[PDB]
């Protein structure tokens, strides 16, 4: 009966939240036991339930964000947190298309006088 993140992947948001609340209640009851003479078994359970809560919240955040990305996929304007991070300078570069652009003057020059492959006899 451990909370493994694989068992939470498909569940629905209201289901997971209910599961979260049980863990939040279970923890607050333990925090009481910490100061009222809880058994060493109950003190060790706190970390087990702190991380279980974090496991549930991770899966809730991941499931929400994976669906938000599906939602804004085709949209021209996406929320900043859904945009590629990289670095600030790497986000201000000319993109792939703009770097590949050439003027018609340069395009003509490469067509007429392409670099050739040759050899010079010994």
């Amino acid at each position: 009966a451990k909370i493994k993140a694989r068992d939470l992947r498909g569940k629905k948001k209201e289901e997971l939240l209910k599961q979260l609340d049980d863990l939040k209640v279970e923890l607050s009851q333990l925090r009481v036991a910490k100061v009222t003479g809880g058994a060493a078994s109950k003190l060790s359970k706190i970390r087990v339930v702190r991380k279980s809560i974090a496991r549930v919240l991770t899966v809730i955040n991941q499931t929400q964000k994976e669906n938000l990305r599906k939602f804004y996929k085709g949209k021209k304007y996406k929320p900043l947190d859904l945009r590629p991070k990289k670095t600030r300078a790497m986000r201000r570069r000319l993109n792939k298309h703009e770097e590949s652009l050439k003027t018609k003057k340069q395009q003509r020059k490469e067509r007429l006088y392409p670099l050739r492959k040759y050899a010079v006899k010994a």
Binding site: Q64, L68, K70, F71
Partner: peptide, 25 residues
């Protein structure tokens, strides 16, 4: 049975926050 066990693509609109939904409505 305890021993037997122990020895071995589209948006989901329910997961979108309620705020985003209203904006498209």
């Amino acid at each position: 049975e305890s021993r037997k066990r122990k020895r071995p693509n589209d948006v989901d609109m329910s997961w979108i926050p309620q705020e985003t939904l209203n904006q498209i409505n």
